[PDB]
Write a protein that holds these residues in place. Structure first.
Motif, mmCIF file in Angstrom:
data_model
loop_
_atom_site.group_PDB
_atom_site.id
_atom_site.type_symbol
_atom_site.label_atom_id
_atom_site.label_comp_id
_atom_site.label_asym_id
_atom_site.label_seq_id
_atom_site.Cartn_x
_atom_site.Cartn_y
_atom_site.Cartn_z
ATOM 1 N N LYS A 677 18.000 -0.230 1.740
ATOM 2 C CA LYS A 677 17.221 -1.263 2.387
ATOM 3 C C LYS A 677 17.483 -2.462 1.493
ATOM 4 O O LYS A 677 17.297 -2.582 0.260
ATOM 5 C CB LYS A 677 15.812 -0.805 2.404
ATOM 6 N N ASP A 685 5.679 0.794 -2.318
ATOM 7 C CA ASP A 685 6.055 2.029 -1.902
ATOM 8 C C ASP A 685 6.344 3.169 -3.008
ATOM 9 O O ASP A 685 5.774 4.184 -2.941
ATOM 10 C CB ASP A 685 7.032 1.941 -0.861
ATOM 11 N N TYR A 711 8.490 11.448 -0.820
ATOM 12 C CA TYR A 711 9.977 11.144 -1.023
ATOM 13 C C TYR A 711 10.595 10.083 -1.865
ATOM 14 O O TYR A 711 9.655 9.252 -2.310
ATOM 15 C CB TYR A 711 10.585 10.892 0.430
ATOM 16 N N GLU A 724 15.024 8.294 -0.143
ATOM 17 C CA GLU A 724 15.370 9.528 0.056
ATOM 18 C C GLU A 724 15.252 9.724 1.661
ATOM 19 O O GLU A 724 14.272 9.511 2.122
ATOM 20 C CB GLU A 724 14.677 10.509 -0.838
ATOM 21 N N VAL A 726 14.415 12.247 4.340
ATOM 22 C CA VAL A 726 13.855 13.339 4.521
ATOM 23 C C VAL A 726 14.445 14.369 5.438
ATOM 24 O O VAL A 726 14.402 14.057 6.707
ATOM 25 C CB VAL A 726 12.177 13.526 5.045
ATOM 26 N N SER A 729 13.159 16.102 10.056
ATOM 27 C CA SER A 729 11.901 15.344 10.300
ATOM 28 C C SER A 729 11.954 14.198 11.428
ATOM 29 O O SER A 729 13.118 13.456 11.434
ATOM 30 C CB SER A 729 11.438 14.673 9.141
ATOM 31 N N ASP A 798 6.891 4.387 5.231
ATOM 32 C CA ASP A 798 6.676 2.996 5.267
ATOM 33 C C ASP A 798 5.115 2.465 4.877
ATOM 34 O O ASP A 798 4.236 2.214 5.755
ATOM 35 C CB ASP A 798 7.023 2.368 6.573
HETATM 36 C C1 LIG Z 1 12.558 8.429 4.617
HETATM 37 C C2 LIG Z 1 12.798 8.841 5.903
HETATM 38 N N1 LIG Z 1 13.180 10.029 6.261
HETATM 39 C C3 LIG Z 1 13.553 10.449 7.483
HETATM 40 N N2 LIG Z 1 13.944 11.600 8.043
HETATM 41 N N3 LIG Z 1 13.430 9.379 8.636
HETATM 42 C C4 LIG Z 1 13.086 8.003 8.417
HETATM 43 C C5 LIG Z 1 12.622 7.655 6.930
HETATM 44 C C6 LIG Z 1 12.460 6.440 6.952
HETATM 45 C C7 LIG Z 1 12.112 5.347 6.280
HETATM 46 C C8 LIG Z 1 12.882 4.178 6.229
HETATM 47 C C9 LIG Z 1 12.621 3.076 5.240
HETATM 48 C C10 LIG Z 1 11.533 3.217 4.449
HETATM 49 O O1 LIG Z 1 10.973 2.392 3.388
HETATM 50 C C11 LIG Z 1 9.736 3.090 3.150
HETATM 51 N N4 LIG Z 1 8.850 2.615 2.054
HETATM 52 N N5 LIG Z 1 9.640 4.186 3.475
HETATM 53 C C12 LIG Z 1 10.471 4.384 4.711
HETATM 54 C C13 LIG Z 1 10.927 5.548 5.398
HETATM 55 N N6 LIG Z 1 12.779 5.926 8.369
HETATM 56 N N7 LIG Z 1 13.137 7.007 9.334
HETATM 57 C C14 LIG Z 1 13.230 6.977 10.503
HETATM 58 C C15 LIG Z 1 13.094 5.545 11.083
HETATM 59 C C16 LIG Z 1 15.021 7.253 10.808
#
Ligand SMILES: Cc1nc(N)nc2c1c(-c1ccc3oc(N)nc3c1)nn2C(C)C
Length: 910
Positions: A677, A685, A711, A724, A726, A729, A798
């Motif tokens: 990002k 975060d 995460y 990371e 996940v 999910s 997020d």
């Molecule tokens: C961490 C994660 N794992 C999984 N499995 N999917 C996910 C994500 C995320 C994500 C992306 C940017 C992020 O910035 C912060 N602070 N937390 C976040 C989580 N987005 N998605 C979606 C939108 C595809």
């Protein structure tokens, strides 16, 4: 010589700036730091060469272990009569054939015992051994080592198997531990010998108390004061003498002068005796403008600010001429002065520059030695005479109520106001306070720092002060405690009691509080550098946390010099870090083009550009075959360009996929997925996810299985970082493809007898996130920032904001009927069920557990005030958790408060 020049190029690439830039710094503190810190480098290198090769392998692959060997009750009950089923893999000779050996062994087994059992099962197959001497030459348990299958984690130390985080995690999650038996000499040979060389720069009076005089400081003039002539009428320099955030006397202003000619030449006289100046005393100043008027109160406004240590690094009281290049005013600064602000001159020399002059006493004035301080404190030592001061309590003045009163005061949170009556009270009973060690931070704040007589007595108390818990000691390292004796005591507690597990856990805060240190060379920086150089897992994140802040010119000198010393002694890891630094560079430069140049183009076109740019030879080589900065035990092999995409989210992050080149990658994960990002500050975060992890650990140790998902999140620079992914999910919205949709989805993913465990996991994870989000005041939840795993594990993503982002306590995670239906296993009246009653009890028990550990959370946030995080700029921001945890109220009053907030949010049920 030639090898030094090459190393200088490598360190330069790692930190961002060339080593030569440090050589040209005239400041003797900078050059003394560079030279004197090398003793930490020497010491750490000696420890790594102590018992070679093993001690070098221990530095590179330290045991990823829990702090206590003792296993919680519900975790032990997951074992089969205190035994664990472990699978041990052996790679046998040709075609690299894998052979598994399932062992049933005690959870408390040492790796060498585990290796012996595996070789016994391997030799059982040839029944020749089995009956007559199965021993097989002491089974040469010293010829092998256990590695975690799928990653670079080794079991090199004699710990009980259950203490290793991977095994405890396997027990908790009901997963089978897969370990690989590797020959010791195969690992050792892979490990190169570090050749630490000393750099070329390693070759290069009256007492303060004998000065019967009041303090004076001269303000000469200012330059680079470029203000609008039409707006501003007059200007002045505001000044103050501070110990931390607290004034030692009233603030003194210069006369008002026109902005055209800022030349004051005034000797400012302060309300302080020079011998009474505490060691950490600082001059705080600012250039202000006074406008208006319209027949209203005079319009003051700070233009620039600056702070200076009244004593230099050599304990010398600052004397002579001195010019300070000032800093710009940060948005929403209250008073005209900024005492919390960084002490020192702005590296940008094209900025407001105030010229000062300090007094001269016909000799080098130095702060007294501990022998002088002890003697004076001992020399500071009838009934009616002691009665003349509320700050004096003699022998036989300690009743049982005052003893209980001091105990009651010690239990109060760091943000609780300790009255002046309580301060006199605490100080008068300072000798009894020794018997309740944890009260030290309250006693220290009760001290009159503008009195050498009191401070000298406090110094002697701190000297022979009993040790306190590392978590309690950390509070003494924040901005409120500037004294080197106090901070030195805190560092001593961490040196003695802080495990490397806990050091890794709290490393973010420890790196931050370095910013509050008066000098470059101090006990905290030496402690942290030694740890970083004796544990590569600590060193990795120490490197990144310091590098992520190099773009900040407030800390770039300190952090640059600290990183240089680290790089010069970390060994071969520098070469690995440089690969990561280059990989991140390529990602920043690529994302910057997409964000700037190609931001308006279609996804197909943006993807076309991404793929073309990623397939470039210099790019391909740089961005594959390196260690994941999120977890350097994770090897990132070749990129899976087909799986790599530009995400539909704002700031358009890259979803990246690398192959896992581990021989046993299949038994962990074949592909490593990371979100890169560029655009968002990831610090908030990172801190929330740290607090979530801490909260989970509290609950797990209390015997409350509420599974959280903190995460991986790493800030690598100025609004750039890694997240990371996940695995398996989906968001609530990407489940919705009615109210029973979510429950129906989990039913299909978890059919048969597994259904009950999936619902349980959902209810338990849901309860944890409900409690965690309410306490922390996380940003409002919705269908796109709430996620669910295939097994039923609910979690959030997020976070963005914590504490009060409104600027009267919100409930971020409001449980819709979708969540309650799953909790009630498809019921109609989901509120009045035996499943919801169980869920509520989980939330209450979780709420009260965090309430008991409130001092820790307040302290973790307090140490983070040094970072420029916008929602954490004052102690009033932190005070939001005092509200959510209802600390002023009783435990039963706190339950009622929580129940009422949940009742109002959900419109009934609680
Ligand atoms: C961490 C994660 N794992 C999984 N499995 N999917 C996910 C994500 C995320 C994500 C992306 C940017 C992020 O910035 C912060 N602070 N937390 C976040 C989580 N987005 N998605 C979606 C939108 C595809």
């Amino acid at each position: 010589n030639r090898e030094e020049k090459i190393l200088n190029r490598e360190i330069g690439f790692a930190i961002g700036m060339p080593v030569c830039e440090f050589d040209m710094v005239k400041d003797p503190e900078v050059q003394d730091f560079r030279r004197n810190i090398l003793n930490v480098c020497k010491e750490a290198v000696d420890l790594r060469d102590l018992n070679s090769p093993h001690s070098r392998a221990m530095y590179v692959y330290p045991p990823n272990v829990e702090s206590s060997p003792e296993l919680p009750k519900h975790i032990y009950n997951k074992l089969d009569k205190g035994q664990i089923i472990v699978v041990i893999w052996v790679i046998v000779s040709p075609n690299n054939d894998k052979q598994k050996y399932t062992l049933k062994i005690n959870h408390d087994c040492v790796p060498e015992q585990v290796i012996a059992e595996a070789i016994r099962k391997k030799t059982r197959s040839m029944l020749l051994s089995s009956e007559q001497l199965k021993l097989c030459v002491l089974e040469y348990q010293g010829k092998y080592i256990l590695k975690v299958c799928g990653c670079d984690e080794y079991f090199l130390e004699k710990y009980p198997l259950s203490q290793y985080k991977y095994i405890r995690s396997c027990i908790m999650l009901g997963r089978m531990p897969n370990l690989m038996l590797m020959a010791k000499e195969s690992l050792y040979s892979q490990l190169p010998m570090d050749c630490f060389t000393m750099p070329s720069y390693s070759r290069r009076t009256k007492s303060l108390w004998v000065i019967n005089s009041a303090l004076r400081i001269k303000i000469l003039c200012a330059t680079y004061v470029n203000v609008n002539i039409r707006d501003i009428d007059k200007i002045y320099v505001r000044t103050g003498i501070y110990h931390g955030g607290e004034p030692l006397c009233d603030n003194v202003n210069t006369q008002r002068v026109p902005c055209s000619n800022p030349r004051w030449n005034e000797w400012l006289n302060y309300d302080i005796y020079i011998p009474d100046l505490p060691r950490a005393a600082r001059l705080c100043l600012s250039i202000c403008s006074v406008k208006g008027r319209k027949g209203a109160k005079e319009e003051h406004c700070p233009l620039a600010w600056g702070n200076i240590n009244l004593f230099d690094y050599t304990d010398t009281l600052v004397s002579g001429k001195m010019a300070l290049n000032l800093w710009p005013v940060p948005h929403g600064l209250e008073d005209l002065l900024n005492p919390i602000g960084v002490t020192g001159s702005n590296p940008n020399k094209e900025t407001p520059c105030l010229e000062l002059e300090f007094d001269w006493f016909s000799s080098v004035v130095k702060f007294p030695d501990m022998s002088v301080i002890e003697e004076h404190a001992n020399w500071s030592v009838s009934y009616s005479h002691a009665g003349l001061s509320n700050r004096l309590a003699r022998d036989n003045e300690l009743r049982e109520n005052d003893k209980e009163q001091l105990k009651a005061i010690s239990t109060r949170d760091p943000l609780s106001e300790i009255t002046e009556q309580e301060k006199d009270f605490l100080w008068s009973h300072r000798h009894y306070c020794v018997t309740i060690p944890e009260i030290l931070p309250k006693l220290l704040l009760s001290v009159k720092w503008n009195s050498r007589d009191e401070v000298a007595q406090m110094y002697c108390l701190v000297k022979d002060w009993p040790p306190i818990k590392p978590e309690q000691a950390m509070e003494l390292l924040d901005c409120n405690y500037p004294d080197p004796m106090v901070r030195g005591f805190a560092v001593r507690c961490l040196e003695k009691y802080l495990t490397d597990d806990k050091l890794s856990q709290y490393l973010i805060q420890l790196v931050q509080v370095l910013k509050y240190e008066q000098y470059l060379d101090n006990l905290l920086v030496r402690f942290l550098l030694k740890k970083a150089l004796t544990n590569q897992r600590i060193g990795h994140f120490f490197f990144w946390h310091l590098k992520s802040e190099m773009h900040n010119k407030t800390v770039s000198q300190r952090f640059g010099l600290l990183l240089e010393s680290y790089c010069r002694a970390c060994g071969m890891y520098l070469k690995h870090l440089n690969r990561q630094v280059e990989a991140m560079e390529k990602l920043i430069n690529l994302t910057d083009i997409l964000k700037q140049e190609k931001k308006d183009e279609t996804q197909k076109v943006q993807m076309k550009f991404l793929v073309e740019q990623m397939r470039r030879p210099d790019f391909m080589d740089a961005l594959q075959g390196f260690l994941s900065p999120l977890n350097p035990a994770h090897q990132l092999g070749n990129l899976r360009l087909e799986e790599c995409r530009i995400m539909s989210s704002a700031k358009r992050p890259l979803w990246l996929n690398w192959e896992n080149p581990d021989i046993m990658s299949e038994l962990l994960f074949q592909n490593n997925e990371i979100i890169f990002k560029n655009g968002d500050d990831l610090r908030q975060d990172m801190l929330t996810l740290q607090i979530i992890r801490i909260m989970e650990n509290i609950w797990q140790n209390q015997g409350l299985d509420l599974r959280m998902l903190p995460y991986g999140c790493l800030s690598i620079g100025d609004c750039v970082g890694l997240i990371e992914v996940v695995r398996n999910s989906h968001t609530i919205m990407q489940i919705q493809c009615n109210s029973h949709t979510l429950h129906q989805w989990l039913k299909d993913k978890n059919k048969g007898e597994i259904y009950d465990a999936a619902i349980d996991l959902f209810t338990r994870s849901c309860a944890g996130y409900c409690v965690a989000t309410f306490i922390l005041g996380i940003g409002d939840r919705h269908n796109s920032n709430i996620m669910v795993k295939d097994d039923g594990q609910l979690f959030h993503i997020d976070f963005g904001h914590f504490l009060d982002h409104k600027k009267r306590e919100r409930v971020p995670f409001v449980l819709t009927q979708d969540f309650l239906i799953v909790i009630s296993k498809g019921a109609q009246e989901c509120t009045k069920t035996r499943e919801f009653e169980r869920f509520q009890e989980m939330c209450y028990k979780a709420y009260l557990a965090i309430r008991q550990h409130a001092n820790l959370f307040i302290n973790l946030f307090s140490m983070m005030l040094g970072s420029g995080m916008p929602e954490l700029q004052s102690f009033d921001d932190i005070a939001y958790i005092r509200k959510t945890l209802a600390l002023d109220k009783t435990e039963q009053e706190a339950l009622e408060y929580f129940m009422k907030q949940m009742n109002d949010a959900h419109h009934g049920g609680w």
